[PDB]
Amino acid sequence: MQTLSERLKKRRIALKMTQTELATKAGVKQQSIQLIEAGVTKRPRFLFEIAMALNCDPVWLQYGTK
Amino acid sequence: MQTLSERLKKRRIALKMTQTELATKAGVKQQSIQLIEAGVTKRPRFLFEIAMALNCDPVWLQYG
DNA sequence: AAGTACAAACTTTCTTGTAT
DNA sequence: TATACAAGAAAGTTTGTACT
Numbered sequence A: 001m002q003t004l005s006e007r008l009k010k011r012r013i014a015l016k017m018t019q020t021e022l023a024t025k026a027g028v029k030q031q032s033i034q035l036i037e038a039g040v041t042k043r044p045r046f047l048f049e050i051a052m053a054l055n056c057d058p059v060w061l062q063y064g065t066k
Numbered sequence B: 001m002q003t004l005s006e007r008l009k010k011r012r013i014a015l016k017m018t019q020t021e022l023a024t025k026a027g028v029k030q031q032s033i034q035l036i037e038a039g040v041t042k043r044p045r046f047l048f049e050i051a052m053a054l055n056c057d058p059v060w061l062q063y064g
Numbered sequence C: 001a002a003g004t005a006c007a008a009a010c011t012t013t014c015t016t017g018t019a020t
Numbered sequence D: 001t002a003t004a005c006a007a008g009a010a011a012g013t014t015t016g017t018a019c020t
Helices: A004-014 A019-025 A030-038 A049-054 A058-062 B004-014 B019-027 B030-037 B047-053 B058-062
Strands: none
Touching: A004 A030, A004 A049, A004 A058, A019 A030, A019 A049, A049 A058, A058 B058, B004 B030, B004 B058, B019 B030, B019 B047, B047 B058
């Protein structure tokens, strides 16, 4: 009953990644990862480019489990 | 194929729907979809939703 | 009518700059 | 070195309509 911001952290934290390694594995600016993480951004448009970076299912990041 | 556009049309039609029909099930605006196929929307926000009306795969729909 | 396009307005996301 | 906040610019979505 998670947020997307919660999945980004746990994931990015578990791949032991800074917000700038992730921000950049995925070609983003770190400030963009932050926002998603902040609860600020809710439908990142780079949701696929970043899942690649986190190596996770885009649909899981975006939406949760069941 | 190519572009998101090429992939979006083909399949709409082939699914046999119209912008307004899709868009109404993707449940966005006929217009949002016009811009996509039109090649102006490079990265939909309703993509899991569009693609899910068309009934496929977002990755597949987005890219391939 | 039926189906698709075209355009400003309004919104959400991503960046250019620091601050902490 | 890592993360966070603030305006504004870019990408998308709606609102409204014109054309075939």
